[PDB]
Design a binder for this molecule. Structure first.
Ligand SMILES: *C/C=C(C)/C=C/C=C(C)/C=C/C1=C(C)CCCC1(C)C
Ligand SMILES: [Cl-]
Length: 207
């Protein structure tokens, strides 16, 4: 099982999700963007494009462009469910972008300064979790019982799984380089598929 095989698997999974969401169908267009963008990133990586050598590790640049564009769309989807005003959107999307940019920069820096960048993303992530579990949950409470229930289920899926990524990053090549690239990639392909396509199908089921 090679890296390219794992990338192709993620590509296929994102494509199936993309077509499913497009067929079912603001919410549906967002889900198409979430999995559609990831599909492209995985194909590019499957073709061997964007594999950037950094010191002694290999960094996958399309992954971070993907995350920077798709994760704010996931937060946007959750913000619509919760009924956020256009100002609360700005805070959480700003916090999200800090996490994503810090990870991208830390991965691309060869020296230990990269752990300083990782730490900053961790701090901003804790602030993002606070807004999901607190203010956004208060806001979602004002909606119908079914919408509130859908928000809580997507929120917990999001919080629990997103919290695993920084550990995979740190244990993988970008960090202490403990986990091997193949295992590290396999774990992230699984998480990407669940936080995007699984996320989407839970929404379809409730609709
Ligand atoms: C579809 C892709 C998803 C949901 C990716 C999520 C990625 C994260 C939640 C990554 C978080 C990170 C930290 C909290 C600190 C810095 C390193 C990151 C980017 C792995
Ligand atoms: Cl990476």
């Amino acid at each position: 099982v090679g890296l390219t095989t794992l990338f192709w698997l993620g590509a296929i999974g994102m494509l199936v999700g993309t077509l499913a969401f497009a067929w079912a169908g603001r919410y549906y267009v967002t889900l198409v963007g979430i999995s559609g963008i990831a599909a492209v990133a995985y194909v590019v990586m499957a073709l061997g494009v964007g594999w950037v050598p950094v010191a002694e590790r290999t960094v996958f640049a399309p992954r971070y462009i993907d995350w920077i564009l798709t994760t704010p769309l996931i937060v946007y989807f959750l913000g619509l469910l919760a009924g956020l005003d256009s100002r609360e959107f700005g805070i959480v999307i700003t916090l999200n972008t800090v996490v994503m940019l810090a990870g991208f920069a830390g991965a691309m820096v060869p020296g230990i300064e990269r752990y300083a960048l990782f730490g900053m993303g961790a701090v901003a992530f804790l602030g993002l979790v606070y807004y999901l579990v607190g203010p956004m949950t208060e806001s979602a409470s004002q909606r119908s019982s079914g919408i509130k229930s859908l928000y809580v289920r997507l929120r917990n899926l999001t919080v629990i799984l997103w919290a695993i990524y920084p550990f995979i990053w740190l244990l993988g090549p970008p960090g202490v380089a403990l986990l091997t690239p193949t295992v590290d990639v396999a774990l992230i392909v699984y998480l990407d598929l669940v936080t995007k396509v699984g996320f989407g199908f839970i929404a379809l089921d409730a609709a």
